[PDB]
Symmetry: D2
Subunit: 330 residues, 4 copies
């Protein structure tokens, strides 16, 4: 957003820092086929230089299959085939041990008279039995909400008009040899559904495949902590990002940064392990780059640490452990 | 502090316009602090709904730790932490009612007051414990004596934290069970939710005659999850206003403050604690705020906020929130 | 000569009451007066015995006889978590914190004329349904009740299935030091473990934390699957005969049991992994303390020979038993 | 007596039943390169007819990297690269919706003076903090045991001589589009570490990729319930299997069968969800193929169901829900 970028890790360590960036338009025609698995086997759709900008025309989580409140999700969708992905985008010079920095500049709704979509998919959500939390109870009612929206507000209903706080649900890089579905978050990023990953945020992803192989998709107009019903307000967007490369920075999990905080993003089940992963990664980050002594960092976070529950519905839950940048002062 | 006029405690509390009697629950009045919360303890004080109570709480270690050279494993015996004040009896309280506890203020108690943070062996969020049973050596045994005042917590040369006090253990008695002071459950307990401080009203479901309110474990500050096992534990002068709401069936504790309402669920694994909180919030929105169930569920998937209380105690605690602006018709 | 293994049991080798002509007490409903739904040190004692004595307990079913027809509706007749009415507390002379109560179950027979067991699907309670802990918004499962005829040989489930009579105690426990835990929860004091192995021919070891021990028993099952997945087993009223003895100064953190072929550490918690960790770790500590094992060898050996029994996966805390065959205890 | 096979699902529904099978020798020379990811992108190494036999020369979980008790696992291994896989094997006619039936005939130790290996790998095991159950404690001691073995016994130590009960730790088929690492079990099979999957067992795996794409590996000379320290007695083997194909049999999870029982194998975290998955699958199996009414099956299993804890160390835990074949009688 403002001048905090000057002190960001991306600007201070990114190799593309002072470059006049080339802006690429990743349209649907360039993408050709959207992907439902994130790995090293997909044919690259674009190759960029670190520091370049990319304007992505993303598709909603249902790849436009739902367009009416009278639609029936169980008849139009097949789990886990949600979150069609743009990519893979190749970053010149990226190799295992590096980090892709993704700065989201803006996110606007795409199409004339744009609509977002929230849905209650049978056997999927936070307060229902699913195919993982296998119960014998009947699934919840099958609902769909077509919500009108603009760059300022989300028109949920007569009673509630929500602010437009867009963010990317699925942001990731390829694993070394595995190919993970677009519904799962892991140590490569993925379907994290962390509300903070929107305009004014920089997400750091660990490279494990040559070229990085950046994937993006599943834009949300807004989202609650946990994305409890299974979906947020899913919409097609024009997401503009700046991608840079940090050389030889060993990360085990995704990290992000914004004007006010730094955050370690862990993903797993049960939810406590996702939280352990995040907090422990944050502690290692504080010791490595911010001069903290390990036990002091641990005990300090027991007084100042902040937690963001991302999703609690996907194959793996996602949690972000934060620390306010004011507490990083030496 | 105008929001109190619209609070559930003021609008439904029977003690609302009373000139309250202020009781001083000193250590001499308390006699013996408790490590179990139930209906078997002898009452220490009886009050009228609307009365104020000035509680002289003891720290989580009951003063057993006073030096950074102390060794927790030699001075503490788990799970005997969080000595409790109470039980306090509310006149007229019976099963089906709710005790509303409004915290007015919290100040450090004693001359040259110090808070305490400790890494207790086999206890904490990033260590094997007696529940998450591992064979690894326990983490180093550490203790921090932190100087503090009504304005700041002097953690170190590098970090000076703001003083945001809150109560770690706030509860009412179960009908027949007696739960230890280290565990949070449907009666409240050791929730360690940072939001339960000055300017908050906590609603607890009565299941025993008289309510039997217990309080303790004051924190000068606390992170989400209380990850190392302890916050900045200190002895305090906690002033509360306790009132009674008649015939309001609650299954779990709820709280309210200037900006939000929250349902507090406690359990393991952490997902279930969160499910409990969110589901309770949804039932609360349907019952008292005119929401249709499925709309509330899908709406919270866009606006719900989550507070990770503790992720170290026998049961983890999570708060599901909704901003009061979204309660408008 | 099947009861030969008892001679080598921990109860016989270390129990203070070994060799005594035991006094047999009849814990009838008239002696019990009121059954309890919470296990702690505040209940009035109903019986005091000497270590080595026998007790014939007339237990009540998990519903305290509230259900007697397949047309009954559990949600209208039961209030959770008030299940498993308990017999006790029984006081053992000399028992104090640091000791262990050894409970050997001799036999379990169905009580009453034309006895019936009961299996039920209670709304918001069970392994494959949302509950008040695993809080879901889905409708509860159908409300079912099965009245099963039974005898000392078989459980007449249906025309198609006749199950063998393998009775065991669901709730066996001792009082905590100061807490009073409900009769539906298992913990480090024993409790509602629902471990099928705790039946005739088994000796359960419980850690004493309250003076006199304060032994509680109840919730007899005619049979039970691993996990007790629907929420209930075949619940029935029984005549359970036990022999209770006392082992002095044997520090245990969790319940343990022993039978003709194995030893087992019983852990209880949520999530289920932690219940299993507790059990296995306790077993490892037991092998190091009493059977001359080196810790890491025991750990790696159990990774090859350890056996696990899923007790319940429905109660407030799940229960898991980690076992080792007695043949592997030989030096 | 192998009389029970006549009533097995493989013999009654397998298309290859009655064929004079062709026996293939899947040697290391045929395999060329062992795989650490299971998916549809690997080049096929062998194509067989349903009913054929395959003699597989498997490699141990460490791909021979450990050969001395003085070896240091953290210096010789890189997690999660364990369990080198043989395959993919193609079954002629296999397509999505089918099931691969894998009957294990025998398993013998391979090599001169064969040795099995048990190891305590840092940050991996049931009773230690790991990278998923992220703790700050020091890892457990780094230990290795070289165990001599033969077709009759496992020479653990002077004090303990264990019986030779071999079984396959990793048995799987390819996902439709994903490629899952060889350390993870899921709905495609994988690193289940279920002791029952040995000689005299038939494992049923759901086909989701054309040709099935069968993968096998990680032979164990023995294993405890949970494989608590992280590893069993890992060894290189000569595993002989008979692979057949069952047409149009919709399965969501792996199933197995032996002389005395049928079992549904679920994999997930936390451990209760793995168990829910298994039991629910068993109930659906009993309703579909054995004439049970759903609620009766559920309540009956609450009296007769048996549970096998497979592993409680891998990225996903594995649990088997069983029912004795005597209770399947109409
Ligand atoms: Na998403
Ligand atoms: Na989404
Ligand atoms: Na606390
Ligand atoms: Na505290
Ligand atoms: Na029970
Ligand atoms: Na029972
Ligand atoms: Na394995
Ligand atoms: Na293995």
């Amino acid at each position: 957003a403002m001048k905090w970028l000057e002190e960001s890790i991306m600007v201070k360590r990114g190799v593309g820092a002072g470059r006049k960036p080339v802006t690429h338009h990743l349209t649907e025609e360039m993408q050709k086929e959207f992907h439902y698995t994130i790995g090293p086997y997909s044919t690259p759709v674009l190759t960029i230089e670190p520091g370049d900008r990319v304007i992505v025309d993303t598709r909603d989580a249902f790849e436009g299959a739902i367009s009416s409140e009278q639609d029936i999700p169980s008849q139009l969708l097949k789990m886990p085939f949600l979150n069609p992905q743009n990519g893979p985008i190749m970053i010149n010079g990226a190799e295992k041990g590096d980090v892709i920095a993704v700065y989201i500049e803006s996110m606007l709704p795409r199409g004339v008279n744009p609509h977002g979509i929230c849905a209650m998919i049978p056997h999927f959500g936070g307060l229902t039995g699913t195919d993982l939390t296998a119960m014998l109870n009947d699934p919840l009612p099958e609902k769909v909400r077509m919500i009108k929206l603009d760059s300022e507000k989300v028109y949920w209903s007569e009673r509630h008009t929500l602010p437009y706080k867009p963010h990317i649900g699925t942001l990731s890089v390829s694993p070394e040899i595995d190919s993970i579905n677009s519904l799962t978050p892991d140590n490569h990023g993925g379907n994290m559904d962390v509300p903070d990953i929107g305009p004014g945020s920089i997400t750091y992803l660990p490279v494990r495949a040559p070229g990085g192989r950046l994937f993006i998709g599943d834009a949300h107009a807004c989202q609650g902590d946990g994305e409890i019903c299974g979906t947020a307000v899913e919409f097609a967007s024009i997401t503009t990002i700046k991608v840079d490369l940090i050389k030889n920075w060993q990360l085990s999990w995704p990290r992000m940064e914004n004007a006010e905080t730094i955050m370690s993003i862990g993903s797993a089940r049960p939810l406590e392990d996702a939280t352990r992963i995040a907090y422990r990664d944050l502690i290692y980050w504080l010791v490595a780059d911010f001069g903290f002594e390990q036990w002091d960092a641990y005990m300090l976070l027991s007084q100042c640490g902040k937690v963001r529950l991302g999703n609690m519905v996907d194959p793996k839950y996602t949690v972000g452990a934060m620390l306010n940048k004011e507490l990083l002062a030496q």
